[PDB]
């Protein structure tokens, strides 16, 4: 019926310890596992018993399918991350003085999804609050990923695509202008600089609202691993729901000769979102995303 599994942070750590996994995606925000000379020093304590009752652990051994999924998370060829939030996305930041150093908490308004692919196997790990749910997820094309993302976001908040003319603007100029605009709190009156860049008034308004007071946000990006090394996708897709509708922000991939990068400011229309996901996957450092593997020889 259902193959999904749910554990808290410590339960995930016990899975790591049993399967000898040093670390997983940082977005899941677990604590590392360092193997000592004894693994009986985490013992059998009740966190383990709960997992014994859920069929997650049989005897002292982890469930086989679950162990396989955790294997996928442990050393993926490809990672695809989405950070979702109700309201402004804080990217993991909880502003509190009582937050401990290296806190494994995440903001209450936030939850993160990690799709890992090892070989041909796709595994989902969803972090909401203190809970992590691991399961099998089916992925084929950029569009399917975009579908998963859109479902996740629409579940937080429902928004129609903003009505604006899609436009490409120079990346660093846009960064500087936006950084100056952020000082005024993205007031539409202070958006003269962005209007000078050739961005439409409607776009500056919808973006101003989306940056000033978003209803929901999503950040989608990928990671690729080869041998000892790794690299991030050069582009990040950002969805932001403003009172003037939902906006998609993603950079177009650079030329073979490079020289500069472009930022695409678009409506959230499904076509343009498929485009955004596709560009994110195509900005990965090693080869094509779908068929790639971290083993060279």
């Amino acid at each position: 019926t259902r193959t999904d599994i749910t554990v808290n942070v410590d339960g995930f750590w016990m899975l790591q310890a049993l399967l000898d996994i040093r670390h997983v995606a940082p977005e899941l925000r677990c604590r590392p596992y360092v193997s000592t000379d004894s693994n009986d020093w985490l013992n059998e304590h009740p966190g383990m018993a709960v997992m014994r009752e859920q069929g997650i652990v049989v005897n002292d051994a982890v469930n086989e399918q679950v162990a396989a999924r955790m294997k996928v998370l442990a050393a993926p060829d490809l990672e695809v991350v989405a950070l979702l939030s109700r309201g402004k996305l804080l990217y993991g930041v909880i502003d509190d003085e009582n937050q401990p150093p290296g806190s494994r908490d995440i903001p209450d308004n936030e939850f993160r999804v990690v799709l890992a692919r090892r070989g041909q196997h796709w595994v989902s790990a969803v972090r909401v609050g203190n809970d992590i749910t691991v399961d099998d997820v089916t992925v084929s094309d950029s569009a399917s990923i975009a579908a998963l993302v859109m479902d996740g976001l629409e579940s937080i908040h429902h928004a129609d695509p903003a009505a604006i003319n899609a436009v490409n603007v120079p990346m660093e100029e846009m960064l500087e202008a936006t950084k100056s605009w952020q000082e005024s709190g993205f007031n539409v009156f202070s958006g003269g600089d962005l209007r000078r860049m050739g961005i439409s008034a409607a776009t500056v308004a919808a973006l101003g609202q989306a940056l000033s007071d978003p209803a929901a946000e999503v950040a989608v990006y990928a990671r690729q691993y080869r041998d000892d090394a790794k690299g991030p996708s050069a582009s990040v897709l950002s969805l932001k729901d403003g009172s003037g509708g939902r906006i998609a922000l993603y950079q177009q991939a650079r030329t073979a000769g490079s020289g500069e990068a472009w930022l695409a400011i678009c409506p959230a229309t499904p076509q343009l979102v498929q485009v955004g996901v596709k560009t994110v996957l195509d900005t990965l450092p090693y080869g094509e995303w779908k068929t790639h593997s971290r083993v060279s020889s």
Partner: protein
């Protein structure tokens, strides 16, 4: 235990604070002096016994020798144990120096967090997000690294202490 239960700030700050190895080194010196003196003590005792055995060599003296045998053995064993203490203390100080050296400097951690925060402040358009994640992975790597360092530190110290065996009460001479 498992020191990865704690963040890099804790393990690094912990290993970098404190008075240092000096008081251990001093102790080592002291334990060496003991090792010397007691060896002399041993050598004198056994000489004294022999002297007695040479002076009388009657059944009474042999009885005394038999009576004092367990204490002689005990004194010997005591010297053997004494010779170990300096050695193991220095092994421990070594372990500490290596833990102190291999640990991730606080400044690298601080730098990591600071860079992360700078990226956050500039992230309104969301394009620094993957880099932020990278910085988080580096922080987790510091976490793990400090974990391993403290593991090895613990193991070395444990191995050294295991070689210092409990002092035993001297037997009566009788």
């Amino acid at each position: 235990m498992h020191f990865e239960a704690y963040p890099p700030e804790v393990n690094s700050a912990n290993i970098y604070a404190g008075p240092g190895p000096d008081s251990m080194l001093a102790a080592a010196r002291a334990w060496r002096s003991l090792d010397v003196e007691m060896t002399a003590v041993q050598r004198s005792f056994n000489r004294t016994l022999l002297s007695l055995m040479d002076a009388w060599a009657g059944p009474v003296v042999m009885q005394l020798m038999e009576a004092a045998k367990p204490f002689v053995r005990w004194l010997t064993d005591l010297c053997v144990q004494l010779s170990e203490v300096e050695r193991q203390i220095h092994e421990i100080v070594r372990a500490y120096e290596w833990a102190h050296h291999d640990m991730v400097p606080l400044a690298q951690i601080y730098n990591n967090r600071a860079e992360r925060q700078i990226l956050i402040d500039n992230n309104a358009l969301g394009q620094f997000t993957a880099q932020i994640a990278d910085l988080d992975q580096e922080y987790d790597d510091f976490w793990d690294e400090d974990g391993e360092v403290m593991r090895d530190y613990r193991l070395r110290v444990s191995d050294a202490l295991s070689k210092l065996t409990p002092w035993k009460a001297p037997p009566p001479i009788a």
